[PDB]
Amino acid sequence: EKAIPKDQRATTPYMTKYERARILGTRALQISMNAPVFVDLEGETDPLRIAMKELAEKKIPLVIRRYLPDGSFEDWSVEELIVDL
Amino acid sequence: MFFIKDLSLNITLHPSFFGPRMKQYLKTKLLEEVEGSCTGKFGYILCVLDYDNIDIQRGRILPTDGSAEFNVKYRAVVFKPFKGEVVDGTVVSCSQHGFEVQVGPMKVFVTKHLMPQDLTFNAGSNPPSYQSSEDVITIKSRIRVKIEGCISQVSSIHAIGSIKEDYLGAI
Amino acid sequence: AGRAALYKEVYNVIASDGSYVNYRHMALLVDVMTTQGGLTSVTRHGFNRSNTGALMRCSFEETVEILFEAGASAELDDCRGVSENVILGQMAPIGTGAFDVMIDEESLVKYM
Amino acid sequence: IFVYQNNITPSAMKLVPSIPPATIETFNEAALVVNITHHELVPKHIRLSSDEKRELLKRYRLKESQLPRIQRADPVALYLGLKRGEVVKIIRKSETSGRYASYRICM
Amino acid sequence: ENAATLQLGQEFQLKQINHQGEEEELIALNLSEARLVIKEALVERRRAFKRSQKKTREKELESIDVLLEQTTGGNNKDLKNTMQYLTNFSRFRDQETVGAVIQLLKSTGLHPFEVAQLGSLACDTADEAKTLIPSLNNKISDDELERILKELSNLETLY
Amino acid sequence: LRFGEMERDCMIAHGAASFLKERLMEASDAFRVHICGICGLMTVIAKLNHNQFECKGCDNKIDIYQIHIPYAAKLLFQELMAMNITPRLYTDRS
Amino acid sequence: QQYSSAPLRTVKEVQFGLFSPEEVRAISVAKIRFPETMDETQTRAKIGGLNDP
Amino acid sequence: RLVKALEDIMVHYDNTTRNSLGNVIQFIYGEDGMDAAHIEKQSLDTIGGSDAAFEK
Amino acid sequence: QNAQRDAVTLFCCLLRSRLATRRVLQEYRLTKQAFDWVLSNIEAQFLRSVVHPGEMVGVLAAQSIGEPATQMKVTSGVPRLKEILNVAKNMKTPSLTVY
Amino acid sequence: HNGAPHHAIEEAESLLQFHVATYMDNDIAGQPQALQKSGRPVKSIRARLKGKEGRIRGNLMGKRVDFSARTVISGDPNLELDQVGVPKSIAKTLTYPEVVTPYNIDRLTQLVRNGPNEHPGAKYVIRDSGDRIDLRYSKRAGDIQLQYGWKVERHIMDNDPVLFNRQPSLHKMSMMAHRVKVIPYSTFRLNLSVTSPYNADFDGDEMNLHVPQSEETRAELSQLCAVPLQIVSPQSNKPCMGIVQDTLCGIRKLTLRDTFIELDQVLNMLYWVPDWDGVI
DNA sequence: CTAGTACCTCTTAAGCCTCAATAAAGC
DNA sequence: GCTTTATTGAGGCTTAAGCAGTGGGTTCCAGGTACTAG
Ligand SMILES: [Mg+2]
Ligand SMILES: [Zn+2]
């Protein structure tokens, strides 16, 4: 019951800097552990650069759970989030 | 005792196994855990149904580790004996203290002091058996006995029963 | 009115030497000092006397007395505070740690 | 509403709760000589109905104790006669924003 | 302590929770229904494996054994023993019979465990049934108990 | 070096929760402790070689969860236990 | 440090209730009755005492 | 002392500054909800100017 | 909606003061494309200026209030800040102003 | 058990209570403090949890760190704003556990072959099982073949984010991330401007450098707390870090209308700007 | 005789109990 | 009309608090006394 539907979300759709940093770190950690890469690499080996490129191309399949103080959580996909930075 | 209920299982997966087939792989790890499981809390897990309808919740990523923790909720049928119930089984072995009866995935033992007076052990037949004034018991026999006590093991369940009320024994 | 006077005094003392501090910080300070019914002084007898997490107040000057009080009252801590997570060595609900990151199994297939 | 000149003996104070259904408030002549609300520092206080309180809690998703607390003997509460579990909205003028709306619930 | 006097444990409550949080009534099943659901689960597993890889007491036992070996075979030897125990002394072989039995038991509205025992255990006299489950003594009328017992006996399959 | 309280709050302001967790749990003393799901006490007998888990305080067999915490945390918990204060570590919210 | 089969999950709440003497006895595997911290010859720890194995 | 008092206060996704207990210190972060760094000193023309200047 | 409108009231006043027809046409000579670009840039900057969720507002406020004190008739300076933070039932140099 | 006179029993009970109280709380107000056999008061659990030296504020709120260094700081105009000089010895001692991957397998193998003694190398190679093998103690370091999933403690290289801080962290901007630049000297070197947020004076001031040990930490430091991101100070909503004293004087002198520059100096100044477009 | 071995030895913030007055109820 | 009450408050005494980090040089194996083993 606490979970809110996909619509009727009061959180800001625009990506937060903390969320961007967390997603980049998680993607870099996964890539460093021999995880699949969804974007072709043009002579690039740094995990952080690959994560940034994937975020730019919105190829990151991670999720963000916006947690309200009460406890309810709202799910947001990386693709729909807008990267202002 | 043949009860269908929802069970939640937490499964850890390495981030390396992240391809499309991971789901199937995850399912395999589910098949290697629920089958053969025997816990005193939830009893013995019998089977898991609706394999194609299994729903997996979004995986949980550790704060620092790259492993993904998925909480999968599935409907499964489990078995758990209770004191005072009567169940039927097949004799598996014979001994001086009594004969063990395999029933389902569990074993049942009957105390000698709680046996009919007419019933008596006999070693004159190969293998040793029991003779009664109006019943015959051997290794290959269906015996219905009442369970009076239950013992829980790490990966096994044992039952202690007796045959004193009427209509019990060979049927 | 007391909160407004406290904010004005804080602004005056900060600007006495010419230093400039944004209004938001002073507003937050006065709000936290006035969030309760009265004015909660920033001391061991003020906010440290509230009903926050036991470990959070333990990290303040009063260390063992608060533990004894919690034991007597059997206080329950939800571990939502920074101090609780720091002591437990877990990612506190702060910024990056406030939320959690999951995996979409439906987008993964199409992204592959 | 009852207003005294010098002071109120404790006997009247303990007798006041003798009438639950009827609420009686005691005020000092000196205290009411000058209206507090006319002061610039005090913002505008508006009483909220039970339905308004429920709607506010539902929208913001707050409990009774999460809202800011205000003393029972607060001069503003006495002026408005706020009761226990009553939420009052405070509208204030600030330099950073044109106005700000907060809420306070009596403890 | 768990016994036959309806003093279930902290988890075996009369109500159960659902994946969506809804509360439902506990539902039990008999041996025939258990076998049917197990067979359906095995068929579903076989279909899943096939799609993933793409891109009279003498013959039924062999088919069940080979099906178990093909999928979820070899992980544990207890599954085969349980399957043999269920199959060797089963009562109903047709889905219609078990469906009718469960539909009839639904009308009774008794505790799921009691109806499961009645549909699984065999009784012939009122006194035997009463002593079998002393707790369920002043719950079911003698006439109703006799009627349900004779109906269950008649519904028994002839193997 | 010592990670001072001032640095701790500065990093908290920075919002680098992961950095603080790594610093206070990986770059510093690291311990793994077992707690029951009913009594929530670190006094759990866990033979990893035999994979046998059992707590004398509570009659439970398999209700044990492992948690990674600094050695200082368990030291403080034991000291509190000496003072008849029992921090009941639970993995779920009541 | 060593492989463990117990599930891994961070703590979410910490109750601070009192420690009952009965719980102390139940959890206290050993007993202390020898003030000496070591046995004779200072080779083995006192049995059922301080610094017991 | 200030750090200890203000340690638990954080702004959530609802733009309300709340402590560990969840009490709302401010329904809006600084009565504006904007980021402190982005704030800058700017002049308001409406406040200044005479009636004739405002008209023209 | 009311809270959102109240919060951005000052910024709306600023926009009306600056983005006035007289100013846009007399003081400025912006065109359709230029005006649209200005509106889009203003909107984007305002959206970026929103407070980032999860930021430790309390810790930032504590640091901002503490740094000036370290940098630094009527009592003032560090003693005044300490008195204000504390309950300070007794006043060293109490004062009152009446107009 | 040997007869209870009830007189000495009270004294024994009081002594036991005093001993228990001292054990749980050595310092009792208005009561004598138990004295240890040696010339020091007996330490109790309550004393062990009192403050700075207590476990709460001595081992939980603030605890020692393994991967970190502390040393003096010196000015360096020839370093970028986000770039901090690092001694070669400190870089060798400090290490990062980079996991073996196909992308940089050759680089990690070369670093391992170099060995701990050589700065561009490593000192440990963590295997899959988790056991750590030292390279200096092992004479067959060059014969070890790296495998996927392993981790190697490689020396910090260039463009490696690391936090730099000064012990008096009065404000938020006193701890910021910098890109490591290895230098052949035993003194940390940082940009001139970052002195203002750190309040650095170079008069023997000692600062601390912390090296991240995970990808998550590196990403968070690069994205959350980075010197370019810390230029704007929320404390006064203005840039706390700016030009420095001598640089300010030089730029003021340069901007003077009466200041003219010869062709040679103009060309050199144009070339100095790394991002100069190229047109004079 | 001689030498081991142990046993004794400066500036505030809250709590509480202890004092001096004051209006009402018993009688 | 007089006596005995619950209440109000006001200070003495008390128990608490007391920036962060780091480099170094000194000192403790404690004194006497009696009982007992080689
Ligand atoms: Mg200096
Ligand atoms: Zn336990």
Swiss-Prot record, chain A:
One of its GO terms (molecular function) is DNA-directed RNA polymerase activity. GO terms for cellular component: cytoplasm; nucleoplasm; nucleus; RNA polymerase I complex; RNA polymerase II, core complex; RNA polymerase III complex. Residues 41-62 are annotated as: Leucine-zipper. It is found in: Cytoplasm; Nucleus. Its main location: cytoplasm. It comes from the Eukaryota. The keyword Cytoplasm applies. GO terms for biological process: nucleolar large rRNA transcription by RNA polymerase I; ribosome biogenesis; RNA-templated transcription; termination of RNA polymerase I transcription; termination of RNA polymerase III transcription; transcription by RNA polymerase I; transcription by RNA polymerase II; transcription by RNA polymerase III. Keywords: Cytoplasm, DNA-directed RNA polymerase, Nucleus, Phosphoprotein, Ribosome biogenesis, Transcription. DNA-dependent RNA polymerases catalyze the transcription of DNA into RNA using the four ribonucleoside triphosphates as substrates. Common component of RNA polymerases I, II and III which synthesize ribosomal RNA precursors, mRNA precursors and many functional non-coding RNAs, and small RNAs, such as 5S rRNA and tRNAs, respectively. Pol II is the central component of the basal RNA polymerase II transcription machinery. RNA polymerases are composed of mobile elements that move relative to each other. Belongs to the archaeal Rpo6/eukaryotic RPB6 RNA polymerase subunit family. Present with 6090 molecules/cell in log phase SD medium.
UniProtKB/Swiss-Prot annotation, chain C:
There is a cross-link at residue 8 (Glycyl lysine isopeptide (Lys-Gly) (interchain with G-Cter in ubiquitin)). Disulfide bonds: none annotated. The tandem 7 residues repeats in the C-terminal domain (CTD) can be highly phosphorylated. The phosphorylation activates Pol II. Phosphorylation occurs mainly at residues 'Ser-2' and 'Ser-5' of the heptapeptide repeat. The phosphorylated form of Pol II appears to carry, on average, one phosphate per repeat. The phosphorylation state is believed to result from the balanced action of site-specific CTD kinases and phosphatases, and a 'CTD code' that specifies the position of Pol II within the transcription cycle has been proposed. It is found in: Nucleus. Signal peptide: none annotated. The C-terminal domain (CTD) serves as a platform for assembly of factors that regulate transcription initiation, elongation, termination and mRNA processing. Belongs to the RNA polymerase beta' chain family. Component of the RNA polymerase II (Pol II) complex consisting of 12 subunits. Interacts with DEF1; the interaction is direct and serves to bridge RPB1 to the Elongin complex in a DNA-damaged dependent manner. Interacts with the Elongin subunit ELA1. Interacts with the Elongin subunit ELC1. Interacts with ASK10. Interacts with ESS1. Interacts with RTT103. Interacts with SHE2. This is DNA-directed RNA polymerase II subunit RPB1. The lineage of its organism: Eukaryota, Fungi, Dikarya, Ascomycota, Saccharomycotina.
From Swiss-Prot, chain E:
The keyword Coiled coil does not apply. GO terms for molecular function: nucleotide binding; translation initiation factor binding. GO terms for cellular component: cytoplasm; nucleus; P-body; RNA polymerase II, core complex; RPB4-RPB7 complex. It holds the Pfam family RNA_pol_Rpb4. Keywords: Acetylation, Cytoplasm, DNA-directed RNA polymerase, mRNA processing, Nucleus, Phosphoprotein, Transcription. It is found in: Nucleus; Cytoplasm; Cytoplasm, P-body. GO terms for biological process: DNA-templated transcription initiation; mRNA processing; nuclear-transcribed mRNA catabolic process, deadenylation-dependent decay; positive regulation of translational initiation; RNA-templated transcription; transcription by RNA polymerase II; transcription elongation by RNA polymerase II; transcription initiation at RNA polymerase II promoter. DNA-dependent RNA polymerase catalyzes the transcription of DNA into RNA using the four ribonucleoside triphosphates as substrates. Component of RNA polymerase II which synthesizes mRNA precursors and many functional non-coding RNAs. Pol II is the central component of the basal RNA polymerase II transcription machinery. It is composed of mobile elements that move relative to each other. RPB4 is part of a subcomplex with RPB7 that binds to a pocket formed by RPB1, RPB2 and RPB6 at the base of the clamp element. PANTHER family: DNA-DIRECTED RNA POLYMERASE II (PTHR21297). This is DNA-directed RNA polymerase II subunit RPB4. The gene is RPB4.
From Swiss-Prot, chain F:
Zn(2+) binds at residues 36, 39, 55, 58. It is found in: Nucleus. It comes from the Eukaryota. A zinc finger (C4-type) spans 36-58. Component of the RNA polymerase II (Pol II) complex consisting of 12 subunits. Belongs to the RNA polymerase beta chain family. The binding of ribonucleoside triphosphate to the RNA polymerase II transcribing complex probably involves a two-step mechanism. The initial binding seems to occur at the entry (E) site and involves a magnesium ion coordinated by three conserved aspartate residues of the two largest RNA Pol II subunits. DNA-dependent RNA polymerase catalyzes the transcription of DNA into RNA using the four ribonucleoside triphosphates as substrates. Second largest component of RNA polymerases II which synthesizes mRNA precursors and many functional non-coding RNAs. Proposed to contribute to the polymerase catalytic activity and forms the polymerase active center together with the largest subunit. Pol II is the central component of the basal RNA polymerase II transcription machinery. This is DNA-directed RNA polymerase II subunit RPB2. The gene is RPB2.
